[PDB]
């Protein structure tokens, strides 16, 4: 049966034709009138040194003061960034962890990794200690990302080519999204927590709807695995970082590639990206041992944060946009401002 | 210039730091091995002799060994292999009885070539185990080794064939001076595989200590 194969071929050809006919001018042509942002200099304000292995994930609290970090020594550490103090140190059951999350209300944290199980830890207990609230199982591959919708729901992305939306109370997979063809390595929730995006090793990204659970849009254009993704603060665009030493800015409504951030010097991949509060600076962590910042409109480099002696693995920006946190494969976790 | 609660918080943070340092010191004295095979190669026995990752465990000669078996991690190998950088040794298992067909020996050779010549494992030593020797002897009683390897001009005896297989598997190494591999034929005797693993681990530990100070 090749008739339906030809149907798919003609449908994708029509999709390409519609996308091409909807393009009239690039974002660079519009933004060339914007004055250059100028050189951006950032200095290390705080340095948090508690870990003893490679750091694989970190997440900022909602209050822009507390953060949580995960490394390979089987420890989850809660840092008070203002005074570099330690609040909690949670020993993990499985030392292979590749993700971390912080609840918006600040009550729960989440962890996961090569053990195919997402653990949820409760922070505020009458007993005065941190204990594992709930273990979620059902994935057949390693977990690569997990994000909190609220105190009762969670979204997980695994290497079994599928994504899941859970229910912490019952502990069962409320919904499952299956539309990929490779490992899924990233996850970013929209500001209204109604849709989200996922980036896969298939060299593509997809826009999922949480409420009912089917893929609405598929964005392609990369050339290798996608390691990170992040939503624009407006909620109508996102940025993907891949292994071909390039970043890309896609738009939801235009259903098209908007711009590409790449320079001939860089040849190494990208491990994590994030935006700024106003959506003007696009930060990106590379394997070149240093992070870069890009003027998101003109696609010009405007600063390099080089203070790490290994590959930068995690990167985040506070809610008020007053700081940046970078964690590399050396145990140190650095704060820039 | 701090309040009472700030001083108490600082004291709590210091206690947390002390606990972390003690845990790291305790956990820095273990020997971590990574176990790799080719499915039915014979990883069962090496393990039983002593849903994701499956860490086994043992204490031998006052040394704590933790063996990590990936097992059923049916996904991309390059997307999680770098998590295992820094392991003391890689225990590769291969069966001498899988030259019949359905090519299994060639798959094991391809896997060994991929693992040995890797950017992450540029200095981690590999302990090669050749098991299922008795069934290989039974097979070589009648069938020749020419089926898997079309060469010779030598002979069809257990010793020469085993030496040929060992040389072929050692030939796949490319970092001949930054990496050393050890080959052992598994024996039914109790304390022969564990002793060999201990000797290889010691050797790696001596080399690591010499690298630390700088003398080597």
């Amino acid at each position: 049966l090749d008739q339906l194969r030809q149907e798919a071929e003609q449908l994708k050809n029509q999709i390409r034709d519609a996308r091409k006919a909807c393009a009239d001018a690039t974002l660079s042509q519009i933004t060339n009138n914007i004055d250059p942002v100028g050189r951006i200099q950032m200095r290390t304000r705080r340095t948090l040194r508690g870990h003893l292995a490679k750091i694989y994930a970190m997440h900022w609290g909602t209050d822009s003061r507390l953060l949580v970090s995960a490394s390979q020594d089987g420890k989850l550490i809660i840092w008070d960034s203002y005074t570099t103090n330690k609040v909690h140190a949670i020993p993990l059951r499985s030392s292979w962890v590749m993700t971390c999350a912080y609840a918006p209300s600040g009550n729960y944290v989440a962890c996961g990794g090569l053990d195919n199980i997402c653990s949820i830890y409760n922070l505020k207990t009458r007993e005065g200690n941190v204990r594992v609230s709930r273990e979620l199982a059902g994935h057949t591959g390693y977990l690569s990302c997990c994000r909190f919708l609220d105190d009762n729901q969670i979204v997980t992305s695994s290497g079994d080519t599928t994504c899941a939306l859970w229910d912490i109370e019952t502990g069962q997979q409320t919904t499952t999204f299956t539309g990929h063809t490779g490992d899924v390595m990233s996850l970013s929730l929209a500001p209204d927590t109604r849709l989200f995006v996922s980036g896969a090793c298939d060299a593509s990204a997809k826009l999922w709807d949480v409420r009912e659970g089917m893929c609405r849009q598929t964005f392609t254009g990369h050339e290798s695995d996608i390691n990170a993704i992040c939503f624009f603060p407006n909620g109508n665009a996102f940025a993907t970082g891949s292994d071909d030493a390039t970043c890309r800015l896609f738009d939801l409504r235009a259903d098209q590639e908007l711009m590409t951030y790449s320079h001939d010097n860089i040849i190494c991949g990208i491990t994590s990206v994030s935006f700024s509060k106003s959506g003007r600076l696009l930060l990106a962590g590379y394997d070149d041992f240093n992070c870069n910042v890009w003027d998101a409109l003109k696609a010009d480099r405007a600063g390099v944060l080089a203070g790490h002696d290994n590959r930068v693995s995690c990167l985040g920006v506070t809610d008020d946009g007053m700081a940046v946190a970078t964690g590399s494969w050396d145990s140190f976790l650095k704060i820039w401002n | 210039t701090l309040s009472a609660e700030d001083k108490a918080a600082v004291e709590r943070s210091k206690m947390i730091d002390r606990n972390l340092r003690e845990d790291g010191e305790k956990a820095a004295r273990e020997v971590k091995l990574l176990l790799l095979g080719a499915g039915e190669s014979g990883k069962s026995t090496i393990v039983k002799q002593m849903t994701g990752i499956v860490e086994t465990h043992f204490t031998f000669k006052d040394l704590h060994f933790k063996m990590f078996d990936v097992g059923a991690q049916r996904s991309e190998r390059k997307k999680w292999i770098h998590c295992f950088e820094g392991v003391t040794a890689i225990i590769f298992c291969v069966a001498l009885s899988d030259y019949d067909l359905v090519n299994r020996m060639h798959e094991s050779m391809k896997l060994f070539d991929s693992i040995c010549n890797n950017k992450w494992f540029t200095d981690t030593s590999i302990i090669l185990f050749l098991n299922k020797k008795d069934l290989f002897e039974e097979k070589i009683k009648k069938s020749p080794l020419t089926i898997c390897y079309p060469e010779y001009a030598g002979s069809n005896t257990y010793e020469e064939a085993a030496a040929y297989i060992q040389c072929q598997f050692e030939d796949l190494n490319k970092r001949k001076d930054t990496k050393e591999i050890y080959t052992h034929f598994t024996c039914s005797t109790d304390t022969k595989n564990v002793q060999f693993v201990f000797d290889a681990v010691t050797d790696v530990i001596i080399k690591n200590n010499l690298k630390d100070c700088g003398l080597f």
Partner: single-chain antibody
Framework: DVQLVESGGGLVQPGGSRKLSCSAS????????MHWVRQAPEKGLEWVAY????????YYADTVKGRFTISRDDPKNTLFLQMTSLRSEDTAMYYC??????????????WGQGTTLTVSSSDIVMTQATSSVPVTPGESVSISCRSS???????????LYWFLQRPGQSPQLLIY???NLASGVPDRFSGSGSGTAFTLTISRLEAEDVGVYYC?????????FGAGTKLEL
């Protein structure tokens, strides 16, 4: 159950060496700084001693320095206070409160039961002015407390705590750091004010709410309580 029991009371001749024990069950005793707080048979509360987690910090009051000692046993979850050379002014009821300090914690949250002891025959001063207030159910009441030194520290915290003691019971934390509501406290209770002037407001006052209200400062040791405002009828 986070029960917290004390023992070692009774009648002691002056010059005795009575020792009080306090056993805690139901929580991580190893990571909780523990205080000992006394109360006179008819007067208000008065801080007595404090020991931190890990026994790295110990504080005593001025009236008890050199006579009382405090110690912990973490393996068996016990807190001891040894008293020496008892005088006629040490007859009181003793409580074994707990407090854990970190960013966002609520010290003094759980109070003990109380052990009765009888004997035969530069500090921040905090006043509470009015002692008795006639109230009726369904009304709104305000309690005013006033310190002598401003409690608004440089970082931004205002260390002041509001406690409520019901008749025949032990005090329970109501408000910590002058604005935060303790766990299990209804919405009606609220706190406000500025430096050296604090006010606790109860809206829609109802029964099982009368008793005594105390304001305490945690800016610097020794901790000082107020005279206490009493609600009746």
């Amino acid at each position: 159950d986070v029960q917290l029991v004390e023992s070692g009371g009774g009648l002691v001749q002056p010059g005795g060496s009575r020792k009080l024990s306090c056993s805690a069950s139901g929580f991580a005793f190893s990571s909780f700084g523990m205080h000992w707080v006394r109360q006179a048979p008819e007067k208000g509360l008065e801080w007595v001693a404090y020991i931190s987690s890990g026994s790295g910090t110990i504080y005593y009051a001025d009236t008890v320095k050199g006579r009382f000692t405090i110690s912990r046993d973490d393996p068996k979850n016990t807190l001891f206070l040894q008293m020496t050379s008892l005088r006629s002014e040490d007859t009181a009821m003793y409580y074994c409160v707990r407090s854990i300090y970190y960013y966002g914690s609520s010290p003094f949250d759980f109070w003990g039961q109380g052990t009765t002891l009888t004997v035969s025959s530069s500090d921040i001063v905090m006043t509470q002015a009015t002692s008795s207030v006639p109230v009726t159910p369904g009304e709104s009441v305000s309690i005013s407390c006033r310190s002598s030194k401003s409690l608004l520290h440089s970082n931004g915290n205002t260390y002041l705590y509001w406690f409520l003691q019901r008749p025949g019971q032990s005090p329970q934390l109501l408000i910590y750091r002058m604005s935060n509501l303790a766990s299990g406290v209804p919405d009606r209770f609220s706190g406000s004010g500025s430096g050296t002037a604090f006010t606790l407001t109860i809206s829609r006052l109802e029964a099982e709410d009368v008793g005594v209200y105390y304001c305490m400062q945690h800016l610097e040791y020794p901790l000082t309580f107020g005279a206490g405002t009493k609600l009746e009828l």
